[PDB]
């Protein structure tokens with residue numbers, strides 16, 4: 094697993110989701126960013142490389158992907174209900190966390 098790979102992968106999928114056409118395509122794209130965000134959880138970013146083992150940064154780090162993983166769970170549900178549209182609208186939330194974390198964390 095590599096975080097730089099995870100990051101390109103989340104963006105590849107986020108692009109597909111915004112552009113998506115079918116429920117199944119949004120859904121699978123969300124699954125792929127879910128797998129990459131999961132691997133992101135145990136990758137080592139250079140930006141939070143050297144934080145302490147017992148600190149308010151290692152937990153808060155993964156929370157960036159954790160928000161995403163939870164919103165993905167809902168967005169899976171929605172896409173499966175045939176809400177292609179609400180699954181794309183949820184991409185604004187994952188994307189808001191992309192940038193919100195990225196304003197300090199990347």
Ligand code: HEB
Pocket residue numbers: 096097100101103104107138139140141154155156157158161187188190191192194195198199
């Ligand atoms: C939201 C789902 C999200 C997206 C789409 C995203 C995309 C990227 C891209 C394309 C990069 C560039 C790769 C690089 O220059 O290193 C990138 C880098 C990093 N990201 Fe993210 N990111 C998203 C979401 C998050 C969340 C949430 C993060 C915080 C937990 C987060 C962190 C990082 C980090 C640390 C990097 C830099 C990696 C490095 O090796 O320096 N990203 N992201």
